[PDB]
Design an enzyme around this catalytic site. Structure first.
Site, PDB file in Angstrom:
ATOM      1  N   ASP A  62     -43.147  47.767   1.618  1.00 53.24           N
ATOM      2  CA  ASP A  62     -42.155  46.766   2.046  1.00 53.24           C
ATOM      3  C   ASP A  62     -42.469  45.391   1.497  1.00 53.24           C
ATOM      4  O   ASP A  62     -43.568  44.885   1.753  1.00 53.24           O
ATOM      5  CB  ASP A  62     -42.196  46.660   3.565  1.00 53.24           C
ATOM      6  N   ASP A 174     -35.538  54.160   3.282  1.00 52.21           N
ATOM      7  CA  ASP A 174     -35.610  53.369   4.507  1.00 52.21           C
ATOM      8  C   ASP A 174     -34.436  52.508   4.964  1.00 52.21           C
ATOM      9  O   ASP A 174     -34.497  52.059   6.125  1.00 52.21           O
ATOM     10  CB  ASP A 174     -36.883  52.515   4.538  1.00 52.21           C
TER      11      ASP A 174
HETATM   12 ZN   LIG Z   1     -39.363  49.735   4.530  1.00 54.44          ZN
END
Ligand SMILES: [Zn+2]
Ligand SMILES: *[C@@H]1O[C@H](CO)[C@@H](O)[C@H](O)[C@H]1NC(C)=O
EC number: 3.2.1.114
Length: 1014
Positions: A62, A174
């Protein structure tokens, strides 16, 4: 061109139709909690038909979430990439896929040359494979399509330059739900395949039962199927190892070898992984192959995808060894035991898709067609992820401001080639990269920790400053006589003036133009219009005197209106919210007329008394217990009165009526027409006192919203010839309705303050017979039909409102356009509602580890368009799309791409010119030059300029609307030597165009062109 209105596509799966039929029951399916006990015929696979299994190692990184981008890079990602380089170099059969180019570029540039060469070798030989190749893995709900394309282009341009590869398979494991805007952009950017994961658990079950998890995903209006992109939807609850080997996580967790103890991880199902040995490999393979064959039952070919990874995995060297060595022992056994009839190996994503299509071409499978979207996602029970459609709304609005500033900076500076000392390419790359980073699925979504949100905001602020610098240097060059132009590339020739960002009441950031007989008699201002058609728009500036008049550069007077500068204050002594007027700054407003993709110069001049062509607004403060409101030199005295209903009309536009609380109650379109009930109301949702709590991701209201208690609010009415407005100070919101002659503009200054566990919603109540149907947009690109479903909870009926929403019946439509993405719905016939902000004290159990308590004042903007649609040619009742009218589309453009305003900084502008772009073609209203970007630096003998052209589709409602010019972007710059159609990222040439002419595109199509200049 395909007709996008009148031909309903015939597809195997249409998501709105599927939703109408599905029951969404949440029953315990056994070990596969949201499915069923999968059964398979052991005889299905044999020596002549084996199951080919590709185990694909991956690491979800991320670019900011619980740590900032740089914190994660230093603590985790640089080690993951360094160890991936070493391990793949030393183990030729090991493979790895990588998605986030923001991190890869940060790592690669820091590598020594020997390691850069080793890295290029493992990419060229197929061990390390880039998937998607965007700067980030973007959110798909709140993101504008223009920024999805921007970030895709940023990452792929870097990959082409440094790694010499362009991914054709996408990996999106995601984002919280999925949008068809992705296959739209990807298919026009060379892609052949894509993979998605977070879709509603009931949808996974339904599609799995029909083996429809792999499908040709086409746009909802595409009758022929030319937009189709092969899509693989993963079947299970997560992309982690326990939910990727098969249906039973208790078994799959035993095959995540990082969970034995020394790594600080374990299996929550209580059975740990065990190291593979010759004494257990047969029982371990029997268990693993059984999971694989069950997973294979959900798909149509004999090629199975088994992702092997999780968040920030493959960091430690010991982790690479433990996963690789144990899987190698399993493969050696499995592949040697004919009775399993399996050939398993490490692979990449592209290898999986190539094998699936080889099976397809051999006639072993045919795939279903599908249209629609995958919102609103729920991962379990009633936990619908509709909260993040609103979370951190200040940054959601900032995203749209920066979107426009990047477009305007790239376009204004594209007209010329610039010396390297001007730092133009440097500032634009910085701006593109910070805006691209924010598209991440923890950036614009509002799902990052507080200090990470601060990091994104600081990055975007730097990007805005970079855009301003490039824009003002460009305006100075475009409007100064060439032989006089003498640039200092570090100097500010103009400052930008933005009336709506951060906004009045949010930041006092605008500069006042200071005029005076003893200091400066006049000031030049310049407006830019990034749209490819002539445009008029009212513009306003702050000035130090009310006695100011406006002229164009030919010295023709321009009609202007002066109004006071009003600021609202929450008076902690009187306990009221009321406006204060400035006695030394005033607003001057006039209509600017600007060429297509052009500039127009005006002059503001002070006089000692009221100028002939400037009028002054009247002001009326409605409240009990008024006190005086002096306004300095302003010529009309403020009037006072007790609260009362009022009506206003500017120009020949609509007549709007307001309640005594300052809220719209009706709209009358023309002198003769009826006063149509259209009522604004503010309400509040709360949080459950038992059960699951709302947080940054989840919206779990404790029932329908309750009205905000308004008390007797203070209402300010300003009436002018060019602009009128009604503003009211309500608890948590200063609500303003502005009228300039057409559909009103609504502005809400939202300050939720310390109201914990509260979500503030703005609702419109009408009597339009919409029933259960409403329309919302997807990424600012298309409008999709929604159907409210009472079989689902309230939060499941909330959808993203990235740019607009509407309701209609046979005769009337109400459209609300937005300048920022927010969540919304239509919870009853005749209503529209959109969330303004939300403040939540609790964490919602998805890993963020905090609530949302960092709210700050934000100025939300909108346009409200009521129209008669009985004469419009609309899609049939079975068509899944809807389309805007000309007025609603122009209103959306007025919010997203307004005129830019520049104030000359110095006292005198020598060599000033009055206009740029008067000879640019004024294109049909449905066409936009979404992107204009020079692709070459000044040292290139052959200059190249890229254009992205988008045509929307507007309803035919009887307006002759005529005479416009053909827009050929390839001839916008002189000396064109070649014109090519390219992929949307500009990375591949698709067609050499005859006559160097770039053809316009069809409705709902987007094309890219590059012109070359000698
Ligand atoms: Zn993520
Ligand atoms: C880029 O890849 C192509 C296709 O394999 C190859 O022909 C070309 O030589 C490569 N470019 C470089 C880095 O030399």
């Amino acid at each position: 061109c395909q007709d996008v209105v009148q031909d309903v596509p015939n597809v195997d799966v249409q998501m709105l139709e599927l939703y109408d039929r599905m029951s969404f029951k949440d029953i315990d399916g056994g070990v596969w909690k949201q499915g069923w006990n999968i059964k398979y015929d052991p005889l299905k696979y044999n020596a002549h038909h084996k199951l080919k299994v590709f185990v694909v190692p991956h690491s979800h990184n991320d670019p900011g979430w619980i740590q900032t981008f740089e914190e994660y890079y230093q603590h985790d990602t640089k080690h993951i990439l360094s160890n991936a380089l070493r391990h793949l170099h030393d183990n030729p059969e090991m493979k790895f896929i990588w998605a986030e180019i923001s991190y890869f570029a940060r790592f690669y540039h820091d590598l020594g040359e020997n390691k850069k060469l080793q890295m290029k070798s493992i990419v060229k030989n197929g061990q390390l494979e880039f998937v998607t190749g965007g700067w980030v893995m973007p959110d798909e709900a709140n993101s504008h399509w223009r920024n999805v394309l921007l970030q895709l282009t940023e990452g792929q341009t870097w990959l082409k330059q440094f790694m010499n590869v362009t991914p054709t398979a996408s990996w999106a494991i995601d984002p919280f739900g999925h949008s068809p805007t992705m296959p739209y952009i990807l298919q026009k950017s060379g892609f052949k395949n894509m993979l998605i994961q977070r879709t509603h658990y009931s949808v996974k079950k339904e599609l799995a039962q029909q083996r429809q998890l792999e499908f040709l995903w086409r746009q909802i209006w595409d009758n022929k199927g030319d937009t189709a992109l092969f899509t693989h939807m993963m079947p299970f609850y997560s992309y982690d190892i326990p939910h990727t080997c098969g249906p039973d996580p208790k078994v799959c967790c035993q095959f995540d070898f990082k969970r034995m103890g020394s790594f600080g991880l374990s299996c929550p199902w209580k059975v740990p992984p065990r190291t593979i040995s010759d004494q257990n490999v047969a029982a371990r393979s029997d268990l693993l192959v059984d999971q694989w064959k069950k997973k294979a039952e959900l798909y149509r070919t004999n090629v199975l995808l088994i992702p092997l990874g999780d968040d920030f995995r493959f960091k430690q060297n010991t982790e690479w060894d433990v996963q690789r060595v144990n899987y190698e022992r399993l493969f050696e056994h499995i592949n040697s035991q004919a009775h399993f009839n399996v050939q398993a190996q490490f692979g990449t994503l592209q290898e999986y898709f190539d094998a699936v299509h080889q099976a397809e071409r051999a006639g072993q499978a045919e795939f279903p067609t599908l249209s629609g979207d995958f919102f609103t996602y729920a991962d379990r029970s009633d936990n619908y992820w509709s909260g993040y459609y609103t979370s951190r709304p200040y940054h959601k609005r900032m995203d749209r401001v920066l979107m426009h500033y990047v477009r305007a900076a790239e376009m204004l500076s594209a007209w010329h080639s610039w010396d390297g000392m001007a730092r133009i390419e440097e500032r634009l790359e910085q701006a593109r990269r910070e805006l691209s980073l924010f598209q991440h699925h923890d950036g614009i979504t509002g799902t990052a920790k507080t200090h990470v949100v601060v990091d994104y905001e600081q990055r975007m602020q730097e990007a805005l400053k970079a855009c301003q610098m490039v824009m003002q240097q460009s305006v100075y060059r475009l409007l100064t006589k060439p032989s006089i132009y003498s640039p200092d590339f570090s100097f500010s020739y103009f400052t930008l003036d933005d009336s709506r960002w951060p906004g009045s009441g949010v930041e006092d950031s605008r500069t006042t133009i200071i005029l005076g007989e003893d200091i400066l008699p006049s000031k030049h201002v310049v407006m830019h219009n990034t749209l490819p058609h002539w445009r008029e728009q009212l513009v306003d500036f702050y000035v130090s005197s009310p006695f100011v008049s406006v002229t164009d550069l030919a010295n023709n007077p321009v009609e202007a209106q002066v109004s006071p500068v009003w600021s609202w204050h929450h008076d902690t002594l009187t306990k009221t919210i009321h406006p204060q007027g400035s006695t030394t700054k005033y607003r001057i407003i006039f209509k600017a007329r600007v060429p297509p993709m052009g500039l127009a110069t005006y002059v503001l001049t002070i006089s000692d008394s009221k100028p002939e062509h400037t009028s002054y607004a009247s002001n009326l403060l409605l409240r009990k217990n008024p006190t005086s409101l002096p306004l300095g030199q302003y010529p009309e005295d403020v009037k006072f009165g007790d609260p009362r209903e009022i009506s206003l009309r500017v120009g020949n536009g609509p007549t709007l009526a307001f309640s005594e609380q300052g809220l719209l109650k009706s709209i009358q379109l023309t002198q003769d027409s009826p006063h149509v009930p259209v009522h604004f109301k503010f309400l509040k949702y709360g949080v459950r006192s038992h059960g699951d709590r709302s947080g940054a991701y989840l919206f779990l209201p404790n029932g329908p919203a309750s009205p905000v208690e308004l008390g007797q609010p203070v209402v300010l009415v300003t009436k002018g010839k060019l602009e009128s407005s009604v503003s009211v100070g309500l608890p948590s919101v200063v609500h303003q309705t502005i009228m300039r002659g057409g559909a009103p503009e609504i502005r809400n200054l939202v300050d939720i303050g310390s109201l914990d566990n509260t979500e503030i919603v703005m609702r419109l109540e009408t009597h339009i017979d919409s029933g259960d149907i409403f329309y919302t947009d997807l990424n600012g690109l298309q409008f999709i039909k929604r159907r409210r479903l009472d079989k689902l909870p309230l939060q499941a009926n909330y959808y993203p409102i990235p740019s607009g929403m509407f309701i209609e019946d046979a005769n009337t439509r109400l459209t609300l356009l937005t300048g920022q993405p927010l969540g919304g719905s239509s919870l009853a016939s005749g209503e529209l509602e959109i969330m303004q902000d939300r403040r939540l004290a609790s964490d919602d159990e998805r890993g963020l580890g905090q609530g949302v308590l960092d709210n700050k004042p934000v100025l939300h903007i909108y346009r409200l368009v009521l129209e008669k649609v009985n004469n419009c040619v609309r899609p049939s009742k079975l068509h899944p799309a809807g389309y805007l009218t000309s007025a609603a589309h122009k209103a959306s453009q007025s919010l997203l791409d307004p005129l830019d305003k520049f104030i000359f900084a110095e006292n005198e502008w020598i060599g000033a010119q009055g206009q740029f772009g008067g000879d640019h073609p004024s294109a049909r209203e449905d066409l936009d030059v979404s992107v204009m970007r020079r692709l070459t630096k000044s040292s290139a003998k052959t200059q190249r300029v890229g254009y992205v052209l988008h045509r929307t589709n507007l309803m035919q409602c009887g307006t002759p609307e005529e005479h416009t010019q053909k827009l050929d972007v390839c001839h916008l710059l002189p000396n064109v030597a070649r014109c090519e159609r390219t992929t949307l990222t500009f990375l591949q040439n698709l067609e050499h165009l005859d006559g160097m002419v770039a053809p316009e595109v069809c409705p709902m199509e987007t094309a890219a062109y590059v012109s070359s200049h000698s």
